[PDB]
């Protein structure tokens, strides 16, 4: 700690705050996350235990980098590479501008790039969302906040249910299934993808059942044909209003035929049919992607 100099608090999550900092010796600018211990409790938080290790094996250009870990006797500081801002703040500055289609396309591609990596390394992120993704002034985006992640196995066991931030949670979680897997991260990317396109949260529910109603009203109440099994799910009520799927041009006006197709494939109801990051990375939608620099 002697060598770091705290500048301004960047954020503040669970176990502590978060500072932008600089190293007095080498000039490197970093991000320091002070996870509390208190001790006399449970020692190291099982959430910090996952973040560190699962991140020990996730070296990728599209995944925030864990520089070091200073596990003193009183706290625990995770030292991170420092990026400019998250996709939420950036999306706000584009409140009128609207993010240009190409830039967006670059964004999603990268995310998917990083996302398939994780998946290829048996890790579910389980908390994809704009404030949890960081861009740099160079046109790069990166996944971050592995606080809520877990290493998965094959095939999977039942995991923790209380998972994913509400607006970006998949329907298989909302309906309480016994098992969920990679597809949950895609559902999230899909929502984020749609969000870049209209700068307003696709399905901003204020509750489990409203989230569900919002999805239904846009994708049409799932039945046994589309998603074999839904009417046997724990939280599924046969009294659900039955809405009819809406035209994607009315949901995602700006998207062209391709972007439409991918999106829809990213939000398939049946997790077993939802497009995967690997398959995504290959959709015709991305045949002409480039790397535009963001406006800042």
């Amino acid at each position: 700690m002697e060598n770091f100099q705290k500048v301004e608090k960047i954020g503040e999550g669970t176990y502590g705050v978060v500072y932008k900092a600089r190293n007095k010796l080498t000039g490197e600018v970093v991000a320091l996350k002070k996870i509390r211990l208190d001790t006399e409790t449970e020692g190291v938080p099982s959430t910090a235990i996952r973040e560190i290790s699962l991140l020990k094996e996730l070296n990728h250009p599209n995944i925030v980098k864990l520089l070091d870990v200073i596990h003193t006797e009183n706290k625990l500081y995770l030292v991170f590479e420092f990026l400019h801002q998250d996709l939420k703040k950036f999306m706000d500055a584009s409140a009128l501008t609207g993010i240009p289609l190409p830039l967006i396309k670059s964004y999603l591609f990268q995310l998917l790039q990083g996302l398939a990596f994780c998946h290829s390394h048996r890790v579910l992120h389980r908390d994809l969302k704009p404030q949890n993704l960081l861009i740099n002034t160079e046109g790069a985006i990166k996944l971050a906040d592995f606080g809520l992640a877990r290493a998965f196995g094959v095939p999977v066991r039942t995991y923790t249910h209380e998972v994913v931030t509400l607006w970006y949670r998949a329907p298989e979680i909302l309906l309480g299934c016994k098992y969920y897997s990679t597809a949950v991260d895609i559902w999230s990317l899909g929502c984020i993808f749609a969000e870049m396109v209209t700068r307003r949260a696709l399905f901003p529910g204020d509750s489990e059942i409203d989230q569900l109603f919002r999805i239904f009203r846009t994708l049409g109440t799932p039945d046994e044909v589309v998603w074999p099994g839904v009417t046997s799910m724990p939280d599924y009520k046969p009294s659900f209003p039955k809405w009819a799927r809406q035209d994607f041009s009315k949901v995602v006006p700006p998207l062209d035929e391709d972007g439409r197709s991918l999106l829809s494939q990213m939000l398939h109801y049946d997790p077993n049919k939802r497009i995967s990051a690997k398959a995504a990375l290959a959709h015709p939608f991305f045949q002409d992607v480039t790397k535009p620099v963001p406006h800042l």
């Binding site: 959430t47 809520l148 209380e162 509400l166």
Partner: peptide, 7 residues
């Protein structure tokens, strides 16, 4: 704006 589920 909902936070992240906690453990």
């Amino acid at each position: 704006h909902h936070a992240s589920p906690r453990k």
